[PDB]
Write a protein that binds this ligand. Structure first.
Ligand SMILES: *[C@@H]1O[C@H](CO)[C@@H](O[C@@H]2O[C@H](CO)[C@@H](O)[C@H](O)[C@H]2NC(C)=O)[C@H](O)[C@H]1NC(C)=O
Length: 492
């Protein structure tokens, strides 16, 4: 009903942004990643004066009814030693934005340049060099609102928060009241009595398993009781407390969000760590004294995490170890358990990192990247996750002879996104996905509220959307509280 209407509205309301309307305002965000940089132009109409409503921010739409986006390579981090050269590298992006945003609105349009992993690993001295060249150079060539705070290297925690804001915004979870169809939660605002709890729309957490890293972000509605003051020190760094509303004295839009990123716990990284131990363990006595030493193709290591009868090899330090897949999904899950790096500490997930309790019976999550590729690309069951249906299909895929899988791949049976790498490593990654989810993060096997997906309302999740939404959160104060800040004239 209201979900279908919102679903239908976002897909069909793509009419080009009316640049001739003086009541539209604009904002610009640059995502400075490692592989490159992208710019997004967002617009919104005048705020309706309701303190409970956020801005109606949307991607700008050109005359062709396309999102106003441009991308360039290879990224800003490459100029670690050429900071003076950086302002010309982002010039194609700002000229692109200046074209679409009306000249009259440039002075009132903010520009935000937020850099992620590419700049995080540079020496701090060189990070500051790049920001300063942008800060001193851009204001002369463009009229956008650009200050020291507008150019920044954001942390991975901030990136997770912004992405969490982005998805919940498009899903309408910050629209309050009219939650008649949607689910609601009881919230304890940080630093407030237990009887001051409020009731508002439940939010959706995000699970993202990339090639290298796995990320998890969700809201912690209820007060958390920590076991140790030290545990709280760790949790401090994994918890974000912010206010999305314009009134700092209201609490309706105050959220506590947990964000954790696990380097080396992505699908591909896990497979590499697994192969590393197979390679290292060649000189273990059990491997040497058996017939799975792996030193020649006639005595290969039998890998249950590979499709049945596939022949693979590990090359490292000039040596070579030969493998043969036995396609045992359940045995693969047991083998890769150690690589989650779980400890015996309570309230911890991967790598012994603290995790706030999840109200599983009253929660929902979206699964991105491998969570979707491992359910859809070959198993063809993306969307609502069901452990029983997934484990069965995953088991059957792994037990299928490599030649049969290979023959089906050539006939086009699988998703057009699936390549031979997907066909080969689906088994390991499906089992890794299953274990990270159900024993890494401890989601119940019967969990019914996970939806794997590639996009939401037929559009990619823009963490830049959560960034613009957070940075512009006070603009509604103009339309609303003009009186509160009226100048007081003195009669001397
Ligand atoms: C998983 O845990 C293992 C240890 O249980 C980590 O391996 C250690 O990494 C440190 C680097 O900080 C080395 O100094 C140790 O020698 C390693 N020990 C062993 C036995 O290899 C490993 O880095 C962890 N994995 C991830 C992805 O964090």
């Amino acid at each position: 009903d209201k979900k279908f209407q919102r679903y239908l509205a976002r897909v069909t309301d793509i009419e080009a942004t009316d640049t001739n309307n003086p009541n539209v305002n604009y904002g610009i965000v640059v995502d400075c990643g490692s592989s490159g940089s992208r710019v997004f132009v967002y617009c919104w109409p005048r705020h309706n004066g309701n303190p409970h409503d956020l801005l109606d921010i949307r991607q700008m739409r050109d005359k062709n009814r396309k999102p106003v986006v441009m991308k360039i390579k290879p990224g800003i981090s490459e100029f670690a030693t050429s900071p003076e050269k950086v302002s010309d590298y982002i010039s194609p992006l700002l000229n692109f934005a200046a074209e679409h945003v009306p000249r009259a609105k440039h002075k009132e349009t903010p520009l935000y340049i937020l850099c992620t992993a590419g700049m995080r690993i540079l020496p701090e001295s060189q990070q500051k060099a790049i920001l300063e060249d942008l800060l001193t150079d851009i204001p002369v060539h463009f009229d956008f609102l650009f200050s020291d705070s507008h150019a920044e290297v954001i942390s991975g925690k901030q990136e997770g928060v912004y992405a969490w804001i982005g998805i919940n915004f498009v899903l309408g979870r910050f629209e309050h009241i009219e939650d008649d169809d949607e689910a609601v939660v009881e919230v304890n605002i940080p630093g407030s009595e237990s009887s001051e709890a409020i009731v508002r729309k439940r939010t959706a957490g995000i699970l993202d398993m990339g090639g290298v890293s796995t990320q998890i972000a969700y809201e912690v509605p209820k007060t958390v009781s920590f076991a140790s003051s030290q545990q709280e020190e760790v949790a401090k760094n994994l918890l974000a407390e912010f206010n999305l509303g314009c009134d700092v004295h209201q609490t309706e839009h105050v959220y506590r969000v947990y964000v954790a990123t696990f380097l080396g716990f992505g699908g591909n990284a896990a497979r590499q760590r697994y192969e590393d131990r197979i390679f290292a363990n060649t000189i273990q006595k059990n491997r040497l004294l058996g017939k799975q030493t792996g030193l020649t193709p006639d005595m290969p290591y039998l890998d249950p995490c590979l499709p049945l009868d596939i022949k693979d090899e590990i090359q490292q330090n000039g040596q070579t170890i030969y493998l043969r897949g036995t396609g045992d999904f359940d045995l693969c899950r047991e083998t890769i358990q150690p690589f989650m790096n779980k400890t015996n500490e309570t309230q911890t997930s991967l790598n012994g990192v603290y995790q706030p309790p999840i109200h599983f019976q009253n929660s929902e999550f979206y699964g991105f990247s491998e969570f979707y590729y491992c359910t859809e690309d070959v198993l063809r069951m993306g969307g609502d996750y069901n452990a029983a249906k997934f484990t069965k299909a995953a088991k059957d895929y792994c037990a299928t002879k490599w030649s049969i899988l290979r023959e089906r791949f050539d006939r086009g049976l699988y998703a057009s996104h699936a390549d031979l790498h997907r066909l080969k490593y689906q088994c390991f990654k499906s089992a890794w996905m299953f274990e990270v989810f159900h024993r890494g993060f401890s989601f119940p096997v019967n969990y019914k509220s996970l939806k794997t997906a590639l996009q939401v309302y037929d559009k990619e999740v823009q963490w830049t959307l959560g960034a613009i939404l957070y940075r512009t959160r006070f603009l509604p104060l103009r339309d609303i509280q003009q009186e509160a800040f009226r100048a007081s004239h003195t009669h001397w």
